[PDB]
Every structure is written in C-alpha cells, then in structure tokens.
Amino acid sequence: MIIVTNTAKITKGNGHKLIERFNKVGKVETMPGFLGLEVLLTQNTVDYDEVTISTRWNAKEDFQGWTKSAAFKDAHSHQGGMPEYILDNKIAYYDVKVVRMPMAAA
Amino acid sequence: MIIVTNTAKITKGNGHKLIERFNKVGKVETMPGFLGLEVLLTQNTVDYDEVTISTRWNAKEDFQGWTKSAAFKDAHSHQGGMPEYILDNKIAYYDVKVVRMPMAAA
Ligand code: HEM
Ligand code: HEM
C-alpha cells in the first residue's frame, strides 16, 4: 500500500481556492487499486496556506496506471495552468508500513 | 476530522527501528474518537530515513483527551532523551477538507 502526496504552499488566504477545485466527484476514484483521496489544510501556518492532496493506492503500479490514463490527461487539461497563488509544490511517495485500527471497529 | 503527524528524520538505515517500536498493539487505539494510526516510510530519501506516524481523530478534542490521559503520560515518561539515530522531530496538524472514496466506474 502506498500514499502519494502533492503539497502546495499557497499565498495566505488563498488555500480555499485549491480546495474547492478538488471538492467534487472525479475520475481518479474509478481507477483500479485506488483506495481514497483526501484534501488537507495545515493548521497554524503563519505567512502562507498549505493544502495537501493525498491519494492512497494498493500499489505504486496502480498510481502509475492512473497517470498514464486518459482521465489523468483530461483532468490535467483545462487547469488554467498552475495558478498564480501557488508559491511551491512538493510531491512525495510513502510506503505504508503499519496500520493500527480503532478498538471500536475491532 | 483531523490528522496529527509526527515526522522523524532518522539516520539512514535506522528507520526500521522506529517502525518496529510502533508495530504492536498500543493504548492509543483504545482512545475515544480515535480513527486510526499508520506509520509511513518516505521513498527516495537520500541522506536519511523519514518515518511519519500519523493518527486520525474525529475531533481535536479527542486528540486533546488522549494527550491528557494517563496512558499518554506513561508512554511519554521519557526522563531520558531520544535514541541517537533520531535526528529531528516535526509535529503537524491537519484539518480534513475533502474525502473522495473509491467509486464504481459505471
Ligand atoms: C506537479 C504539479 C501539479 C499541479 C500544479 C497540479 C494541479 C492540479 C489542478 C489545479 C487540478 C484540477 C483539475 C481537476 O482536479 O480536475 C489537478 C488535477 C488532479 N491532480 Fe494534479 N497537479 C500536479 C500534480 C499532481 C500530483 C503529483 C498528483 C498526485 C496525487 C495529482 C493528482 C491530481 C488529481 C487526483 C486530480 C483530480 C483528478 C480528478 O478529479 O479525477 N496531481 N491537478
Ligand atoms: C515531541 C517529542 C516526543 C517524543 C520524544 C516522543 C517519544 C515517544 C516514544 C519513545 C514512544 C514509545 C512508547 C510506545 O511505543 O508506546 C511514544 C509513543 C507514541 N507517540 Fe510519541 N513522542 C513525542 C511526541 C509525540 C506527539 C506530539 C504525538 C502525537 C500524536 C506522538 C505520537 C505517539 C504515539 C501515537 C505513540 C504510541 C501510542 C501507543 O502505542 O499507544 N508522539 N512517543
């Protein structure tokens, strides 16, 4: 299981613009081995906003299948480019090593 | 829903020791409002290992309850510094803004 994150440093007060763009049903959710997408807003950021798009996958090849897909090319078409309010963008890949679920579900 | 993340930069090759410490049943899974814990290993880190412990909570109050509990005290009795392979420690808090679950492609 892997998580792929795209973390955007955004000019203060503009985070909500990037969140609104992901706040809708899309195509990545239909891909094989997709397990979930979440959008996070970092707390306590002083001079900027930080918005994280996180996607979780059975395996890296499932993510790679999506980035080759047509729907990825359709969802990376009319973006209006990278918005001006985006100061910095980091991408990271994580291996999930331990998962500990609640007792209320056990 | 919120996420609290502790990110440890570790001496390259020693990340498995921290992962191992969390690879067991603990007491945080028993806390009210706890929704899950996972441990991540960042890919393609050059000089070091990076291990992230992420915990998910229904509300900030639930996490606060946990940090005020005798279980958190006892787990953080410490009274002696961290292992020498732990180089740095960063804590972050996130608000979950959007959740998109897998969907049938039809
Ligand atoms: C490298 C610079 C990148 C920029 C500037 C960028 C920006 C954007 C923007 C503004 C959208 C809105 C269009 C839409 O959501 O339909 C979008 C689509 C999307 N991007 Fe990126 N992105 C980048 C790379 C990435 C990466 C690394 C991921 C990894 C998860 C990713 C995942 C997505 C997803 C899931 C969507 C939505 C597709 C859907 O709705 O099905 N993107 N991108
Ligand atoms: C800032 C300095 C910190 C140090 C030196 C530290 C150190 C430790 C150590 C050595 C353990 C081992 C106890 C065990 O394996 O159960 C532990 C437990 C743990 N710590 Fe930290 N910690 C720190 C902060 C935090 C914070 C702020 C969080 C917030 C989420 C956190 C999350 C956890 C979790 C989830 C556990 C395991 C709880 C369980 O197994 O029931 N740590 N801590």
Numbering used by the authors:
A (entry chain A), B (entry chain B): 1 to 106
Paper text:
Bacillus cereus (Bc) encodes three FNR paralogs, two of which have assigned distinct biological functions in bacillithiol disulfide reduction and flavodoxin (Fld) reduction. In this study, we have assigned a function to FNR1, in which the His residue is replaced by a conserved Val, in the reduction of the heme-degrading monooxygenase IsdG, ultimately facilitating the release of iron in an important iron acquisition pathway. The Bc IsdG structure was solved, and IsdG-FNR1 interactions were proposed through protein–protein docking. Mutational studies and bioinformatics analyses confirmed the importance of the conserved FAD-stacking residues on the respective reaction rates, proposing a division of FNRs into four functionally unique sequence similarity clusters likely related to the nature of this residue.
The IsdG monomers consist of Fd-like α/β-sandwich folds forming a β-barrel at the dimeric interface containing the conserved Asn-Trp-His triad required for the catalytic activity in the heme binding pockets. Bc IsdG was crystallized in its apo-form and reconstituted with hemin, the latter yielding red-brownish crystals. The electron density for the heme groups of IsdGheme was, however, relatively poor, and only 50% occupancy could be modeled, with apparent density for the iron ions but limited for the rest of the porphyrin. In addition to low occupancy, the heme groups might be bound with different orientations and degrees of ruffling. However, after the addition of FNR1 (after 950 s), the breakdown of heme is detected in the enzymatic reaction under aerobic conditions, confirming the importance of FNR1 for the degradation of heme in Bc IsdG and the resulting release of iron. Moreover, in the FNR1-catalyzed reaction, the decrease of the Soret peak detected at 427 nm demonstrates the breakdown of the heme-bound Fe(II) state, which is not observed for the non-enzymatic NADPH-driven reaction, where, instead, a build-up of heme-bound Fe(II) occurs.
